[PDB]
């Protein structure tokens, strides 16, 4: 089912946010944070690429919102909660479950759980994510979360996901990662990716990909991406963290 905005739909992109699950857990641990049930339960699996989980799908700054004075950073920080508009209740990471239940169908909830360990349960990551990046757009939750799942799978199945899989636990260079990405989607789209790392030596924690708003309901190709200015804080070499602290 197609993902369509009903309000503030005049934005040009979506940032698919994927996290290297193992790395994510590794960081929460090293920062001395409380271990979540998703990390405490985290365990080794057959397809290493499956460690690439869904974090979210974030629409870019809507022109109609920018027109009212909202800037890129404010948008990145508050999303649907920016003022003067859309001005919806702020979604807080410290109380994700306090955000409104999305209305996601049981079927889509199950598909999401398989790839978004933080969804539902006592985390409620999907409520936080929808309140911040979807509610103000009137997105059908099913089409919204259903699209994240699809995109995550296509990524995992491309040379990008395979790259991660083959270098599981190894140190890689941003250069080769870029070649892996460019291999499936073109050299010119390498700048659509922002990588996030933690620690020193740096290890991967998240992958952010800029996708054209107009190409969101189609299988990814070399015309689905938009370059963006932030390479990330990973440096030219980083580690594809393995499961376990
Ligand atoms: Ca680890």
Swiss-Prot record:
Keyword list, A-Z: Cytoplasm, Disulfide bond, Endonuclease, Hydrolase, Lyase, Nuclease, Periplasm, Signal
Q: Which InterPro entries match?
A: RNase_T2-like, RNase_T2-like_sf, RNase_T2_His_AS_1, RNase_T2_His_AS_2, RNase_T2_prok
Q: What GO molecular function terms would the record report?
A: Enterobacter ribonuclease activity; ribonuclease T2 activity; RNA binding
| Modification after translation (UniProt) | Contains four disulfide bonds.
Under the heading Gene3D superfamilies, the entry gives:
Ribonuclease T2-like (3.90.730.10)
Give the reactions, separated by semicolons, that this protein catalyses: RNA containing adenosine-cytidine + H2O = an [RNA fragment]-3'-cytidine-3'-phosphate + a 5'-a hydroxy-adenosine -3'-[RNA fragment]
What's its EC?
A: 4.6.1.21
* Top-level EC class as recorded in UniProt: lyase
Q: Which GO terms describe its cellular component?
A: cytoplasm; outer membrane-bounded periplasmic space
Disulfide cross-links: 80-136
Q: Which residues form the active site?
A: 55, 129, 133
Q: Does the keyword Nuclease apply?
A: yes
Keyword Lyase set for record: yes
What the entry lists under CDD domains is as follows:
RNase_T2_prok
Kindly state the subunit structure of this protein. Answer: Monomer.
Its function?
Answer: One of the few RNases that cleaves the phosphodiester bond between any two nucleotide. Shows a preference for cytidylic or guanylic acid.
**Which NCBIfam families does the record associate with it?**
PRK10095.1
By sequence similarity, the record places it as follows:
Belongs to the RNase T2 family.
Q: What is this protein called?
A: Ribonuclease I
